């Protein structure tokens, strides 16, 4: 029984970012947490595009690539949805995917902007985050885009479109008391926003017994999940990976004996 006893302080919480501090953790746990924010927090994104008509100046898989990157609301439906690989249905079904439609024709002289607002989902829980709107393609008069897409569950470790973060700022030891980074000329380096030093001194005095214990986070959200949901989803997902691992380890230990 040598578990840490982390404490959490949330400094800033908006609709886009959550700023918080974790204290009394190992650097490995703090790094694995940010590393799960990016790669192992599931969301719903378009991963299956079928284009019926595309007269735009962008080729078919150019459009599909853009549709995959469009963030979709995933706050609570993502937990309910199953992985299409795990689901027992056919290619797709409502329990493992969300169907999308896009049918735009340009007939006016003015350029028609095909945006995420033109994506229509079969489930109100999963919609483009913008509903300015993300531009998919611009249509000239006489050009049309007619496609149907399926959005499925996934996480950033597979493709960056399932990464829910727009930048995870991670920091520790802002005053470099541990000297994990050695400045050739410390006076030349800007103070961290979390620096507690005075203007006169550039580095905190070296701490021989110090260890990384306090970690600063700024988890910005793409929009698919609330920033606080990304953190909670990461903490439960990381716990799930460990609990799943221990179940396998228990079998291996039992199997050997």
């Amino acid at each position: 029984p040598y578990a840490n006893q982390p404490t959490v302080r949330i400094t800033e919480l908006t609709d886009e970012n959550v700023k918080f501090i974790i204290e009394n953790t190992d650097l490995a746990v703090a790094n694995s947490i940010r590393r799960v924010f990016i790669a192992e927090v599931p969301i719903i994104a378009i991963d299956w595009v079928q284009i019926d008509a595309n007269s735009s100046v962008l080729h078919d898989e150019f459009i599909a690539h853009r549709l995959g990157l469009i963030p979709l609301t995933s706050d609570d439906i993502v937990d309910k949805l199953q992985y299409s690989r795990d689901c027992t249905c056919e290619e797709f079904c409502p329990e493992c995917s969300v169907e999308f439609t896009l049918d735009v024709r340009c007939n006016e002289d003015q350029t028609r902007h095909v945006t995420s607002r033109d994506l229509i989902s079969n489930s109100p829980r999963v919609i483009p985050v913008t509903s300015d709107d993300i531009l998919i393609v611009k249509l000239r008069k006489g050009q049309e885009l007619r496609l149907r897409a399926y959005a499925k569950k996934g996480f950033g470790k597979e493709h960056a479109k399932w990464n829910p973060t727009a930048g995870v700022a991670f920091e520790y030891d802002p005053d470099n008391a541990l000297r994990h980074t050695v400045y050739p000329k410390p006076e030349e380096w800007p103070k961290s926003e979390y620096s507690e030093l005075d203007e006169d001194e550039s580095q905190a005095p070296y701490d021989p017994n110090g260890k990384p214990e306090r970690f600063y986070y700024n988890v910005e959200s793409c929009g698919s999940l609330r920033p606080e949901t990304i953190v909670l989803s990461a903490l439960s997902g990381l716990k799930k990976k460990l609990s799943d691992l221990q179940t396998q380890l228990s079998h291996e230990i039992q199997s050997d004996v």
Binding site: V29, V36, L238, S243, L245, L249
Partner: protein, 115 residues
């Protein structure tokens, strides 16, 4: 032409063991844990949690090849302690810390949202 599927880094193909334990013949009370479809995420926390155990003599992990998706964790314990027992305790300590972290983050959100 030779691009592996993206899912191959976290999905086990049929007939693949998630974790295998191999005794280390070089020194006593040392075992090698080969975990499949894992990366520095679990390798680092398990290694760092093991180093917190006073009965663990050696704890270390490695990704033998970035293009492969294996982590090898080498654990050496004292004669009265088993590497497998250290590994299980390390995960429980990690799970307890994560579960406690989840509870304290939820409270922080409620306090921040309330005012």
């Amino acid at each position: 032409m030779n691009a592996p599927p993206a899912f191959e880094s976290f999905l086990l193909f049929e007939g693949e063991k998630k974790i295998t334990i191999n005794k280390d013949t070089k020194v006593p009370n040392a075992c090698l844990f080969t975990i499949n479809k894992e990366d520095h995420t679990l390798g680092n926390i398990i290694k760092s949690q093991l180093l917190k155990d006073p009965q663990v003599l050696f704890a270390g992990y490695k990704v033998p090849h970035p293009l492969e998706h294996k982590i090898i964790i080498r654990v050496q314990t004292t004669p009265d302690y088993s590497p497998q027992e250290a590994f299980t305790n390390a995960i429980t300590d990690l799970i307890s810390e994560l579960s406690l972290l989840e509870e304290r983050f939820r409270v922080a959100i409620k306090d921040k949202q309330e005012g």
